[PDB]
Amino acid sequence: HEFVRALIKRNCHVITTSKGEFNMLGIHDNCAVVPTHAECGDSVTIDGREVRVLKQCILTDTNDTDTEITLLWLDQNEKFRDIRRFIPEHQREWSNMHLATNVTKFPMLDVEVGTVIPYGEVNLSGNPTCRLLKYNYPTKPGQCGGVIANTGNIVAIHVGGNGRVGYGAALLRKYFA
After folding, report:
1. Any idea which residues carry the catalytic annotation?
2. Domain Peptidase C3, which positions?
């Protein structure tokens, strides 16, 4: 609510790649999360400036299936507010979740997507993607990277949809240990 808006303002940035504009969610220290299909390079445009990526980790499950989550370790002095304590340890169903992003098409957007349910593996644009949470909301192109959350629970980043539902990549605390 207030929590989600403060999260966007404090930890989120516009990342621009050849795939367009995405929301980038800082997690802790210099480590941020972006959708894997943003295809970030060795340096990324953040809030209109080139930022060098010290290390990139494309996260996979134990069968090497994409989670659609990529970790960026950024060459910056700033430290993200450590939000790991709000990131769940396991996949679970959540009620009254919001999608929030800040992007040219969707500036300071916050919308209620409702209930978020663990949904498993889905092929997104031909690529198998695991550990997705699904919400019955007609999410739109340009909302990728948006945060799926509510007060105290930071649960996914938005990574796809089909015009009727949205798929979020589950954020799990062990990713960020």
Report:
1. 37, 68, 144
2. 1-176
